[PDB]
Every structure is written in structure tokens, then in C-alpha cells.
Symmetry: C3
Subunit: 123 residues, 3 copies
Amino acid sequence: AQSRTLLAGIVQQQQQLLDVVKRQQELLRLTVWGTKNLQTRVTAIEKYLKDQAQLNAWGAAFRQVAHTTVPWPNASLTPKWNNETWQEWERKVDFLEENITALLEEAQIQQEKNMYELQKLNS
Amino acid sequence: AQSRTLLAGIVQQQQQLLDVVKRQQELLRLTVWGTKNLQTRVTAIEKYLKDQAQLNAWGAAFRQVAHTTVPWPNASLTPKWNNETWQEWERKVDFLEENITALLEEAQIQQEKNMYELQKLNS
Amino acid sequence: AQSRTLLAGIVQQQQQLLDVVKRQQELLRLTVWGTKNLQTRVTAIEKYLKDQAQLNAWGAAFRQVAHTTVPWPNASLTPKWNNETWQEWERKVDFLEENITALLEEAQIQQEKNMYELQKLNS
């Protein structure tokens, strides 16, 4: 009269949930690439903005033999506040990523063990 | 002496976990919109940067009847590397999204079946 | 002959899954900060682009005592479409975030209760 069948359905449900959790992790990795990729493009834009500062007043004088170039900074480059803050952000993700892999590894061993034990009941 | 009550709590716990997993999926969809929305804004910025290249030296000559316009590229437009790489990124998300929906659909049918069977034990 | 041990493994498996779900939430929060941080940088870029519009034709005249400044808009600032749409995006995240916390709180109470009941069976 033991409800082994009900347990089989319950154990199977946990397996499906674990698979979906893993799918979210891969999807999360894809999202991270999009954000990081945008930053690389943003850095390229910063270099072009500096070039615009170089353009100020050229050939604006035909009674003198000189050209005035004023490349005043345009894109404010982040030296310490963004890098130090961004590194902390990346480091937090690395610790959470390692923790999720350890938890998933333990779940896989326990999941198989629970199903293995179930088979012994009705092998 | 069967622990049907314990099973009821266990089955209910799986239902709550499934709901939270679905909530993460919707939240993930909202995050994707933010990243994609930023790219559309970035493209608008690229068009303005090209306009800046057009500004070089105008009216810088009152002893000639001509104007010099030098629209040298400014924003580096991505023709194949980003589009091909971004399409692969979007395609990977589409396959994972379809897989999560299939897994969730199966879980919903199994979850209801497990609860339905539980009701038969004590209906 | 009750499978209390199998239930202990099953109950433990749910606990591990709940922990991983919580880890995804924190990771999701870190991802949100990266996207929002980029927008703040984008606004800074918009201010510099306006400055470029100011640079048009200076000193381009040595037979006149005047300077022509033409600061034509460059970065298209979003007044209502992005803010209204972005506020809706942020609001949707706030409702989903509150819903996930409520579901997790209920799961923690049910999880402890299921384990507490298990202890009574074999305390």
C-alpha cells in the first residue's frame, strides 16, 4: 500500500525543475554577454568623441601661417570609480556562479541517489 | 500510518517553487528589453556622430567662394561581426526559451497529476 | 516499512533547489545594476554631444568682430516615450520582485514545517 508511484511522480517533478533551473543559468550567461558587449562598443565611441574635440577652428585664418588645434577632453573616461566598482560587480557574480555550480552538483548526486533508491523498492 | 500529510506539504512545496521559476522567466524577459532598448539608442547616437564629422572648416575663408566639407566616418558601424554574433546570441536565447516552456508545460501536467493522485488517496 | 529515508532525501533536494533559486535572484539583481549603470554613462555622453554642436565656425573671420556659435541639438533626449516606457518596465520588475519574496517566504515556512514533521516521525 506504499505510494511508490506517487513518489515516482514527485521525484520526476524535481528532475524537471532542476533542468529548468540549469536553463535559466545558461540564459543568464547569454544576457551577461550582451551587457559586456555594449561596454566594448561604448569605449569605441569614447575615442571618437575625443577626435571631435580636436576639431575646433582650422584654416580659419588666411593672414597667418599657423593652425589652432584644441583637443579638450570630451568623453569622461572612468579611471577608478567604475573599474573598482565594476570589478566588485564581476567578483560578486563569480562567487554566486561557483556557489550555484556546487549546489547543482550536489542536487544531481542526490537526485540520482533518490531515484536509485526508488528503483530498489520496485526494481 | 501513511504520511499523506507530509506528501501534501512536499507536493505543495514543489508548486511554490514552480511559480517562482516562472516569475524569474518574466523578470528575465523584462531585463532583455532593457538591453535591446539601449542598442536602439546607441544607433541614434551613431548617426549624430557622423554629423559631427561633417563639421570641419566652414566660412574659414572670405577670399574664396567655396566651402570645404569633410564628413570622415566617426562612429564605426558594425556590418557583419556584431550582427552575425548578435544573431547567434538571439538564436541561443530562442532555443533555451522554447526548451523552458516545454519543461514547464510537462511540470504543470505532472504537478496536477501528482496532486490529483493525492486526492484519490484521501478524497 | 515507511520510506522515511527516501522522504528525507526528497525533502533535502527541495532545500537545495530553493537555495539555488535564491542565488539566481541575487545574480539577477547584479545584472540589473550593470544595465542601469550604463544608462547613467549614456546620459553623460549626451551632454558632450551637445557641446560638439556648439563647435561650428569660430575665428573663421578676421575682417569682422563677431563669432558665430550654432549649438544645434545633437543627442536626441527622450522626454516622455523612454521615461514613461522605462517607468513601466521598472514597475513590472517591482511587482515581480515582491511576488518572488512572498513565495520564497511561504516556501521557507513550509520547508521547515515539512522537515519538522519528518523529525517527529523519527525524532
